[PDB]
Amino acid sequence: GPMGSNAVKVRHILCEKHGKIMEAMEKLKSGMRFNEVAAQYSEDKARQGGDLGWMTRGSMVGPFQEAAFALPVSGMDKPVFTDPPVKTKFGYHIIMVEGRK
Ligand SMILES: [Cl-]
Ligand SMILES: [Cl-]
């Protein structure tokens, strides 16, 4: 149905350990750009600055998906990200959204 066409262009920082995702969160809250935090801490897409690219509805693990579609589009100077981090079976994610349809 139509909702299957919904999509977000998503960027994340993924860490399996809570202590480490909290270190990443502290860096965001100090003003560090999201891609630079992802390079430092993310265990996925680190070499892409956390960028997952576009992901359609149904393609994301459940808690991630719900969190991502709840975020408005933002840019990395004016980010809007998940706080607190979102737990999935991959670990803890901090997510921002750069595009929406
Ligand atoms: Cl600016
Ligand atoms: Cl999950």
The domain tally of the chain equals 1
At residue 24, what is the residue type?
A: A
Q: Residue 91 is part of which domain span?
A: 1-101
Indicate which CATH number applies to the domain containing 82. Answer: 3.10.50.40
* CA 16–ligand 2 middle distance (angstroms): 12
Helix, strand, coil fractions of the chain, as percent rounded to 5: 35, 30, 35
The pair of structure tokens assigned to 98 is: 């750069």
Resolution of the entry in angstroms:
0.8
* CA 74–ligand 1 middle distance (angstroms): 12
Q: Which long-range contacts does 64-69 make (Cβ < 8 Å, 24+ apart)?
A: 64/12, 64/88, 64/93, 64/95, 67/93, 67/95, 68/8, 68/10, 68/95, 68/97, 69/6, 69/8
> Which ligand has the nearest atom to the CA of 76?
1
Q: Which structural technique was applied?
A: X-ray
